[PDB]
Amino acid sequence: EVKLLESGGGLAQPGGSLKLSCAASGFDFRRYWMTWVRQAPGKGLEWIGEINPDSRTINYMPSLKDKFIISRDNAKNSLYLQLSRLRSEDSALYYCVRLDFDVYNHYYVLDYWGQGTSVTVSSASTKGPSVFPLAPSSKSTSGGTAALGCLVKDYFPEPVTVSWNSGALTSGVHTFPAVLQSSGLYSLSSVVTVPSSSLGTQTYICNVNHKPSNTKVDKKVEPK
């Protein structure tokens, strides 16, 4: 019940600036060094910097002055990151990370990580997805299973979240990595496979959320 919840992400215009924030609970935030890390789509991890408990020591990745500004507010158990002079290379997931120091043990670990906020730097406007059913058939069964799904098509920017039956259905679910179409828009599919004989046994609803365009869609996928 260590919690690290990020916010502040979304679409930002090139050259603009943006403030990410992270609220922490379930540990004594006042005593811990905190870290920001990021990861560009399909790429590796990148350390941005860290800040000690009293804000007197702030370490940054080699970069041009004030590209990043890290601060914290111990009264609000909160950590902040100011990004400035935004360009497309800044498009990433940003992670709030707890650093476990320990001088006697010679021990420094990034033990607790937040889920991340997404930042996309672009001047293209936002687009909500269309959600189309991928309908199962009783006659189209492979390997003892029937397959159904949702095609989440033509959205910008990433990400979308997908779930089935409001999170009640998880077994047999595969949500695929999104692909970037030549139109500049993303597309992904989410599928569920179930034992053939259980097909008419339950309802299948895909729940699609796209925060950047405020699109929530609930699609019932019917045997057809």
Partner: protein, 215 residues
């Protein structure tokens, strides 16, 4: 420009020992670099595994250990389990800074498994909109290499399909693949037979799933 390098990809079987390494362009990796390892599982789920070169973090299974091998830091997994499939990042401290390696993808081997194949026609809702997507699903297969060929009235399609693959499943060690063929509504309506043709090591001959437009 300290650069940290790791192997891109490694494969091991369950129960075997596997060693991941981490090298530095500045010097031998030393105790003074306080090497850390971080595990990334699907859904951006992170776990700190090792700190200070060789100290295993609380909660982490005893199977993981850290050490130095020659010039490098090493992560060793003894008796690899299917749930050990992940990306492993090393990171080195160099004075003020932390520097991540590029990460190592660890694949866990299993017996060959043929894909289940499914084809989905475009929905009527999509066709209202002027385009048509045909989707092909290859479910739960191993190893990763799989060919999908799209055919439209038996003509091989090229340059109008996209495909994406899941990470290796932590329980059954398989992959799934999804491929989309995109054409215009007008081109979709001109043709009858839509086929997804699949080849894979587990299939002694190609599996074809197809449907006829409006049947």
């Amino acid at each position: 420009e300290l650069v940290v390098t790791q192997e891109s990809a490694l494969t091991t079987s369950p129960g075997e020992t596997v060693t991941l390494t981490c090298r530095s362009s500045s010097g031998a990796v030393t105790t003074s670099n306080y090497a850390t390892w971080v595990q990334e599982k699907p859904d951006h789920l992170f776990t700190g595994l090792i700190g200070g070169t060789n100290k295993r973090a609380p909660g982490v299974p005893a199977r993981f250990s850290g050490s130095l091998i020659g010039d490098r830091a090493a992560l060793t997994i003894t008796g690899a389990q299917t749930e050990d499939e992940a990306i492993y990042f090393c990171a080195l401290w160099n004075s003020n800074h932390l520097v991540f390696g590029g990460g190592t993808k660890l694949e866990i081997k299993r017996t060959v498994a043929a894909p289940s194949v499914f084809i989905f026609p475009p929905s009527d809702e999509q066709l209202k909109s002027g385009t048509a997507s045909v989707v092909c699903l290859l479910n739960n297969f191993y190893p990763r290499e799989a060919k999908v060929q799209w055919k439209v009235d038996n003509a091989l399609q090229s340059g109008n399909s996209q495909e994406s693959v899941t990470e290796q499943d932590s329980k059954d060690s398989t992959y799934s693949l999804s491929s989309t063929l995109t054409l215009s509504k007008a081109d979709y309506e001109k043709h009858k037979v839509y086929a997804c043709e699949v080849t894979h090591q587990g299939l002694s001959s190609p599996v074809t799933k197809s449907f006829n437009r409006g049947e």
